[PDB]
């Protein structure tokens, strides 16, 4: 019964062992977390979207800026700038997931 | 009005002042408001302005066809899209959303 959760910003995202961690623009909307190469490249540049309905969000125990998001078919590994911002993201994603159900 | 609400997010240039001129902002149309976001570190963002659409006036510029202004009695934002087609997409979405959010 309150306003929907919204969030956008840059997160560092694991790509692969060739390029390692790379900054990506991440947007929370439409029961999804979506990412793009950058803020300016959203028109044609969605590089992925993870539906939140059954998504599991796991803060890391050793890398205190890291959280992982997983559905059956994929896992994204993400790092925020500090642990407070990590917690803001986790809290937003969880609140959005709840509200969208 | 029965389908999902009209929502948009994207970059638009926004007028600041004559020193810094047009500056890109992340702009969001949602829940009867146009809002914009800024960051001081290119990483973490926060909403730095919101306009309620109920009585908003959207004025496409006659000569600068990339520009539209949105005003309520107390405030005005001057906004540019990258071209006039993109301007029109924004204008049309805002005007439709305004109607659909009304009573
Ligand atoms: Cl949004
Ligand atoms: Cl251990
Ligand atoms: Cl542009």
Residue numbers in the entry:
A (entry chain B): 20 to 120
B (entry chain A): 19 to 121
Copy out sentences from the published article reporting this entry, exactly as the authors wrote them:
Crystals of the human CERT PH domain spanning residues 20–122 were obtained using ammonium sulfate as a precipitant. The final structure was refined to 1.75 Å resolution. It contains a curved and twisted β-sandwich that is capped by the C terminal α-helix at one open end. Opposite to the capping helix, the other open end of the β-sandwich contains a bound sulfate, which likely originated from the crystallization solution that contained 1.0 M ammonium sulfate. The sulfate forms hydrogen bonds with residues K32, R43, Y54 and R66, all of which are highly conserved among many PH domains and involved in interactions with the PIP ligand. Nuclear magnetic resonance (NMR) studies show sulfate binding mimics 1,2-dihexanoyl (diC6)-PtdIns(4)P binding to the CERT PH domain, thus the sulfate bound crystal structure likely captures the major features of the PtdIns(4)P bound state. The two copies of CERT PH molecules in the asymmetric unit have distinct conformations in the β3–β4 loop. In molecule B, a major portion of this loop points outward and residue R66 from this region is hydrogen bonded with the bound sulfate. In molecule A, the β3–β4 loop points downward and K56 replaces R66 to interact with the sulfate. Structure B likely represents the major conformation while structure A a minor one.
